[PDB]
Amino acid sequence: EEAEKAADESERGMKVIESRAQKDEEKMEIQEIQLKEAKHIAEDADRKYEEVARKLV
Amino acid sequence: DDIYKAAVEQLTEEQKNEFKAAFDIFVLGAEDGCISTKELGKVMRMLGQNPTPEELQEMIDEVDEDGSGTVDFDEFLVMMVRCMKDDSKGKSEEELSDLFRMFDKNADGYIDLDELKIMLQATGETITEDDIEELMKDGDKNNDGRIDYDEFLEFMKGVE
Amino acid sequence: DEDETTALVCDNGSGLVKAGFAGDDAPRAVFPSIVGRPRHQGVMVGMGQKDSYVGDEAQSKRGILTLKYPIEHGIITNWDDMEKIWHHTFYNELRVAPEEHPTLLTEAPLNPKANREKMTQIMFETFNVPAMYVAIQAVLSLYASGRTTGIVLDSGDGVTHNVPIYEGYALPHAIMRLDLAGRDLTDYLMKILTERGYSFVTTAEREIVRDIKEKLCYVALDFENEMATAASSSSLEKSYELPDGQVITIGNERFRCPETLFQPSFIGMESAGIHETTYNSIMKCDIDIRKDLYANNVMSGGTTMYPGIADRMQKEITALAPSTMKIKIIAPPERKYSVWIGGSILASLSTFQQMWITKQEYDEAGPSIVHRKCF
Numbered sequence: 001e002e003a004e005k006a007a008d009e010s011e012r013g014m015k016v017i018e019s020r021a022q023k024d025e026e027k028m029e030i031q032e033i034q035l036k037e038a039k040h041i042a043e044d045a046d047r048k049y050e051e052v053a054r055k056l057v
Numbered sequence: 058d059d060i061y062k063a064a065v066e067q068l069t070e071e072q073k074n075e076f077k078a079a080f081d082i083f084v085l086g087a088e089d090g091c092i093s094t095k096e097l098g099k100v101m102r103m104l105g106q107n108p109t110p111e112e113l114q115e116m117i118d119e120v121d122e123d124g125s126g127t128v129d130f131d132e133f134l135v136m137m138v139r140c141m142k143d144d145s146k147g148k149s150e151e152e153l154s155d156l157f158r159m160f161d162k163n164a165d166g167y168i169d170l171d172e173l174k175i176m177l178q179a180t181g182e183t184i185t186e187d188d189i190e191e192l193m194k195d196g197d198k199n200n201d202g203r204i205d206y207d208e209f210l211e212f213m214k215g216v217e
Numbered sequence: 218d219e220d221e222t223t224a225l226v227c228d229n230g231s232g233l234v235k236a237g238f239a240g241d242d243a244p245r246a247v248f249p250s251i252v253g254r255p256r257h258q259g260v261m262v263g264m265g266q267k268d269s270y271v272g273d274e275a276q277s278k279r280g281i282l283t284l285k286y287p288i289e290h291g292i293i294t295n296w297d298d299m300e301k302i303w304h305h306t307f308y309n310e311l312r313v314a315p316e317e318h319p320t321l322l323t324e325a326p327l328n329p330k331a332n333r334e335k336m337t338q339i340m341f342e343t344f345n346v347p348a349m350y351v352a353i354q355a356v357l358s359l360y361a362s363g364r365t366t367g368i369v370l371d372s373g374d375g376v377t378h379n380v381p382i383y384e385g386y387a388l389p390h391a392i393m394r395l396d397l398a399g400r401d402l403t404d405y406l407m408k409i410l411t412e413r414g415y416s417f418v419t420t421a422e423r424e425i426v427r428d429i430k431e432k433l434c435y436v437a438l439d440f441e442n443e444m445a446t447a448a449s450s451s452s453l454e455k456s457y458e459l460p461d462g463q464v465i466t467i468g469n470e471r472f473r474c475p476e477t478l479f480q481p482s483f484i485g486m487e488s489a490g491i492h493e494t495t496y497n498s499i500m501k502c503d504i505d506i507r508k509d510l511y512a513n514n515v516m517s518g519g520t521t522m523y524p525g526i527a528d529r530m531q532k533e534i535t536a537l538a539p540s541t542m543k544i545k546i547i548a549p550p551e552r553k554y555s556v557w558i559g560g561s562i563l564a565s566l567s568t569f570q571q572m573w574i575t576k577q578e579y580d581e582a583g584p585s586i587v588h589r590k591c592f
C-alpha cells in the first residue's frame with residue numbers, strides 16, 4: 001500500500017511537471033525565433049547605417 | 058493626408074475603438090508610446106511580410122501629421138485606413154482641360170483667386186477662409202496670385 | 218483576388234523569378250530560379266508523388282533534391298523547367314489563370330531566337346493566353362529610373378548586359394553581353410575557400426556560400442592596399458556563423474571575390490573587366506553623347522546589391538577617362554526590383570494595351586513572323 005501511494009503521487013508529479021516542461025519548451029522556440037529575427041534586422045540596420053554614413057562622408 | 062483624413066473621419070466609433078485597442082497592442086511595452094520603425098517592423102514580422110527600412114521611413118512620412126517619426130493614434134487611423142486608393146482613376150486629359158477651362162471662365166490661361174473663390178461660393182458648402190487659403194496654396198505653387206495649368210495639374214493629386 | 222483586367226508582370230530573371238500583378242510596386246512572389254529533382258527512389262508510401270519540385274519547395278529541401286539551373290549564361294537549357302516554373306507561378310502562388318489577363322514577360326538582351334520562339338509557343342499553344350509580349354529589361358529599368366538617357370548595366374546571375382540609351386534611343390549594335398556574373402563569382406569564392414581549407418563540392422553548399430556572399434561580400438576601394446593591410450588582420454577579418462552553426466572565418470576573400478569582375482584573367486578568359494568593357498562601349502558610341510552617358514549611367518541587377526560598387530566605378534572611370542569633366546554615377550534605391558516596377562507602369566497604358574499580340578495573328582503568321590513584328 002505505502003509503495004503504491006508513493007508511486008501514484010510520483011506519477012501525478014510526472015504529469016504536472018512534464019506538462020510545464022512542454023510549455024517551457026514551446027516558449028523556448030517562440031522566444032528563440034523572435035530573438036533571431038530581431039538580431040538579423042539589427043545587424044542589417046547597423047550595416048546600412050554604416051554604409052549610408054560612409055556615403056554621407 | 059487629404060483622402061487619408063477623410064477616410065479616418067468616415068470611420069465609425071466602434072471601429073475607432075478597435076483601432077485604439079490595436080494601437081495599445083502594438084505599443085504594448087514600447088518605450089516611446091508610439092509606433093516607430095522598430096515597432097512597425099515588429100508588427101510586420103508578427104504578421105508575416107517584411108518591410109524595407111527606407112520603406113518604413115517613407116511610410117511613416119506618409120502618415121504623420123506631427124513630425125515625430127513615429128505613428129500615434131491620430132496617425133494610427135491613417136495607417137489603418139489608407140488601404141483603399143481614393144485618388145486613383147485620373148480623369149481623361151480632355152476632362153482635365155475642361156476643368157481648367159471652366160475654372161478659367163474669363164479665358165486667360167490662369168485661375169485667379171477670384172475664380173476659385175466664386176467657385177467655392179457657388180458650390181454651396183460653407184467655405185471657411187482657412188479652406189480658401191489652403192486650396193489657394195495647394196494650387197498656386199509659386200504664389201503669384203493664380204493657378205496655371207501645370208499648377209492646376211498639381212492640384213489633382215489627392216483629388217477624385 | 219484580382220478585379221482588374223491587367224497583364225501579369227512576371228520577370229523571369231536569371232537566379233530569381235519575380236512575379237506579380239501590374240500596378241504593384243514590388244513582386245509578391247519572389248523565389249530563386251532552381252529545380253529540384255528526386256535523386257533516389259524511395260520504397261516509402263504516402264509522400265507526394267510529385268516528380269518535380271520548384272521554388273521555395275525546392276529551397277526547403279536541397280539535400281535530397283539534385284539542383285539544376287533552368288538558365289545558363291542566358292540560353293535556356295531545359296524547357297520542362299520553364300513549363301514547371303510558369304505552371305507553378307500560375308496555379309500555386311498567384312491563384313489566377315492566364316486565360317483572363319495578358320502577360321508582360323521580360324527577357325534578357327541579345328538572346329537566342331530558339332528561346333523566344335519556344336517560350337512564345339508554350340505561352341500560345343499549350344496555355345490559352347489572350348496576348349503575349351516580349352520586352353527587353355534595359356528599357357523597363359530606364360523607365361523605373363525615371364529618365365531617358367544613360368547606359369544601363371544589368372548584372373544578373375549568369376550574364377551581364379551593358380545597354381546604352383541616350384534620349385530614349387536604343388542602340389542594338391552596341392549591346393554587348395558577357396557571361397560574367399554571380400555564378401562565376403560563387404565559383405571563384407568556392408575555389409578560394411577550398412584553397413583556404415574548407416572544401417565542398419555540392420550545390421547546396423554552393424547556394425549557401427552564394428547567400429553568404431550576398432550578405433557579407435563587398436567591393437574594395439583599393440585592392441592592393443587592402444591586401445597589404447589585411448596581411449596583418451584585426452578588424453579586416455570577420456567570423457561568420459553558418460546557419461547550421463559551424464564557425465566560418467572569412468577575411469580578405471570577401472573583397473577579392475567581386476574583384477574577379479575587374480580582372481577576368483583570374484578565370485583565364487581574354488575578356489575585359491566590366492568597367493573596361495563599359496568604357497570600350499562608350500568609345501563605340503558617338504563623342505557628342507559620351508558626356509551624357511558619363512553623367513547618366515544607371516545600374517540594374519541583383520548583383521549590384523553589394524556595398525561599394527558606386528565608388529569603385531567612380532575611381533576606375535576617373536582613372537580611365539579624363540578628370541576634367543563631371544562623371545556622376547546614379548544608382549536608384551531598390552534598383553533590383555525597379556525593372557519589375559517598370560513592367561507594372563508599362564502595363565497600365567492604353568496604348569500598350571493596343572500593342573499586344575493576339576493568338577489568331579500569331580497562328581496564321583507563325584512564330585518567326587512574330588519575331589519580325591517585334592523587331
Ligand SMILES: Nc1ncnc2c1ncn2[C@@H]1O[C@H](COP(=O)(O)OP(=O)(O)O)[C@@H](O)[C@H]1O
Nearest residue numbers: 230231232233373374399431518519520522553
Ligand atoms: N539581396 C541581394 N544581395 C546581393 N546579391 C544579390 C541579391 N539578390 C540577388 N543577388 C545576386 O543577383 C543575381 C541575380 O540577379 P537578378 O535577380 O537576375 O537581377 P534582375 O532581377 O534585376 O535581373 C544573383 O547572382 C545573386 O547573387
Ligand SMILES: [Ca+2]
Nearest residue numbers: 121125127128
Ligand atoms: Ca507621429
Ligand SMILES: [Ca+2]
Nearest residue numbers: 161167168169
Ligand atoms: Ca481666369
Ligand SMILES: [Ca+2]
Nearest residue numbers: 197198201203
Ligand atoms: Ca501660380
Ligand SMILES: [Mg+2]
Nearest residue numbers: 372373518519
Ligand atoms: Mg539583372
